[PDB]
């Protein structure tokens with residue numbers, strides 16, 4: 196079926212939970228043996244969210260190459276994304292090592308450091324120009340260059356220096372700051388505006404390594420971001436845009452990382468975002 200009318204049909208029939216459970220039943224299951232080794236327990240935020248072995252990002256280290264991060268490679272759309280958990284106190288250095296080694300330009304953050312009165316990730320970037328951060332375990336230095344605070348999101352320019360070679364790179368930090376503590380946003384308008392700002396920066400483009408996107412677990416909000424992006428891109432590429440099937444795209448992405456889209460409300464919000472976005476792209 197088309198999307199917008201399949202949408203109204205699920206709303207009128209109240210069957211979002213049944214649609215979402217079908218997806219869960221049909222999703223791929225692949226091994227995640229490296230994630231479950233005992234030496235990696237303090238490298239995982241949640242015991243039930245692990246990268247698959249076949250698609251995990253490896254750190255260029257011989258001691259321990261493990262990080263909870265996955266490469267989502269979308270062949271027809273010609274987009275790649277790295278989806279990862281919010282860094283932990285003992286993995287902030289690994290996180291920036293990955294950014295460096297994979298040649299990423301942008302980092303997309305979809306959560307606040309504290310939500311619901313608890314910490315959802317470490318404070319992994321510097322908050323003042325004159326107070327830079329050094330990660331001694333991976334030999335990197337990180338500096339805040341500028342910060343632009345808007346009503347729904349903040350964009351930061353950061354400098355990452357490989358202290359071993361003295362090479363430097365500019366990294367863009369795109370921080371969506373208004374996702375509600377419970378549920379999903381009522382309108383997709385500010386989320387779509389945020390996506391378009393990431394796009395306009397060049398961070399999603401083939402001349403750079405994959406964008407790094409995270410929330411707390413790296414599967415819910417993060418899944419919504421890459422699912423909406425890929426579906427809108429496919430609608431631009433194909434002769435028949437109504438042929439884009441959002442459930443099939445999601446099942447394809449779940450071949451690369453488990454659990455993408457965590458609730459039926461997130462599924463519905465993804466439909467809403469793609470539907471509204473497809474009208475703005477044209478007309």
Ligand SMILES: Oc1ccc(CNCc2cccs2)cc1
Pocket residue numbers: 236237238239240241242283285
């Ligand atoms: O330092 C840390 C200590 C524990 C955790 C949480 N680990 C959850 C897991 C339990 C079993 C497998 S994975 C994170 C950091």
